[PDB]
Design a protein around this ligand. Sequence first.
Ligand SMILES: NC(=O)c1nnc2ccccc2c1N
Length: 270
Amino acid sequence: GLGYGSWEIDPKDLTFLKELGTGQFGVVKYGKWRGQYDVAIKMIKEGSMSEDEFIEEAKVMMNLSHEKLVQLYGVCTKQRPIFIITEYMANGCLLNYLREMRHRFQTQQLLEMCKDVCEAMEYLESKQFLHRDLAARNCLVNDQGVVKVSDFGLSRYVLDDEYTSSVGSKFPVRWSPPEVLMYSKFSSKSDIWAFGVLMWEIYSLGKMPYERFTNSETAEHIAQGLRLYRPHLASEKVYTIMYSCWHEKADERPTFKILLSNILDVMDEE
Ligand SMILES: NC(=O)c1nnc2ccccc2c1N
């Protein structure tokens, strides 16, 4: 309506129901839009985000639509704090979900989670859109157990320098290829590397990558050509897939289309 662009949601249409959790931008709540439609409401902590830049990018993100990507519905702007309104994912963050041993996952379920993420990422790749911070902590799980990729591209708007410099205390060292660690070379192939680490997180039931090492030790390990090794729950074929994401030479790493084909092959074989 009148004072709202297509990317803008009227916060007055929101009913707040429950708190879901917190992230690096702050608190996330479950609510309803216009009394009926489930939404997640990300309340963006003051000073945490480059907001004008994010809002311009929201216009682009509005048009990214794929069943395995957490949908952006709009933004509540020109208020303090701003809200990001997204698809509601009732089972919360993938990392926490993996760590709950009650689920007693079959490896077929783990492979399906990898396929869900790979489909989202193949779509993003087809749009030349980098995630830039792919990891289990940035995947969500809905009430049907479907995994979807969340917060794609959002690291570009984070004002905390501890997160954004490869040297920073909060940079995702453990999800980064050598060329990112060494000279900040981001590309489709840094997303591919991260995807490999994510498969490792899934098959490891949410263990931290390089769990015995500091970030500094991890960077040394990786730069010296060494890698994560096979999670107990990963078959030889599944391990081959994740390991292919970690070629020292970025151009030798697969595309998400190729990874998707390889995952489907293993699903048919296993
Ligand atoms: N989109 C969602 O439904 C959602 N988004 N962000 C979260 C952060 C922490 C814990 C849970 C959630 C969550 N369920």
